[PDB]
């Protein structure tokens, strides 16, 4: 197929909820070595979010049974082997995204916006790996730091990509680094800085930003429960 057909097939798959199809097309678009547009970029990201989120979801359930079947030797072995099966799938997916990013998406990022997006996505998928590992937590951090630098310099505090990064990076501190302090401050600041500048919101992103700010506070409220 051609770049324009793949994209329209990717939009069809998403409405069908057929996420592997939608990621196959968007991965094929990516591998054409030309930089991706905002729309293509969001489609690749939505695709692989759902593909990996299914495994992430299967992994959580089966790990919990695994823990609950302590004392039941036969059950616990069955749950462990299957967890391990879901993990292989999950790792292959994270490395699919991570290689795509490394080879195509990060080098060819010609704009600060892209660069922040792809770097946040790099340590998203290393965070997904951290969930399932280890000393690869650090690489989730370096991606996210290089993204959080480039974002604070170039972007308004109400930009959804910068707020969104505030939100993921914060969860990485809270969850992967076990550090609720470095998590809460990061999200209190992201939020407080966005709320002092609500006039910098634009009609194209005010729903995106305003949502993610709610999600920043939600986390902060929980992390004080």
């Amino acid at each position: 197929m051609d770049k324009n057909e793949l994209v329209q097939k990717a939009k069809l798959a998403e409405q069908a909820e057929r996420y592997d199809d939608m990621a196959a097309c968007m991965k094929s678009v990516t591998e054409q070595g030309a930089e991706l547009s905002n729309e293509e970029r969001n489609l690749l990201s939505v695709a692989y979010k759902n593909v990996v989120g299914a495994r992430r979801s299967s992994w959580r359930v089966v790990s919990s049974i695994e823990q609950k079947t302590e004392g039941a030797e036969k059950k616990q072995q069955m749950a462990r082997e299957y967890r391990e099966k879901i993990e292989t799938e999950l790792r292959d997916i994270c490395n699919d995204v991570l290689s795509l990013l490394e080879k195509f998406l990060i080098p060819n990022a010609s704009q600060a916006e892209s660069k922040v997006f792809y770097l946040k996505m790099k340590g998203d998928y290393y965070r997904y790996l951290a969930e399932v590992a280890k000393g690869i937590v650090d690489q989730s951090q370096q991606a996210y730091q290089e993204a959080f630098e480039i974002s604070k310099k170039e972007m308004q505090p109400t930009h959804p990509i910068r707020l969104g990064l505030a939100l993921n990076f914060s969860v990485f501190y809270y969850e992967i680094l076990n550090s609720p302090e470095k998590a809460c401050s990061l999200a209190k600041t992201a939020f407080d800085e966005a709320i002092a500048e609500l006039d910098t919101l634009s009609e194209e992103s005010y729903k995106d930003s305003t949502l993610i700010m709610q999600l920043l506070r939600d986390n902060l409220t929980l992390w004080t429960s």
């Binding site: 989120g53 998203d124 939100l167 993921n168 969860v171 809270y174 986390n219 929980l222 992390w223």
Partner: peptide, 8 residues
């Protein structure tokens, strides 16, 4: 639980 950009 904790909200990310990557759930729901």
């Amino acid at each position: 639980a904790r909200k990310s950009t990557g759930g729901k």
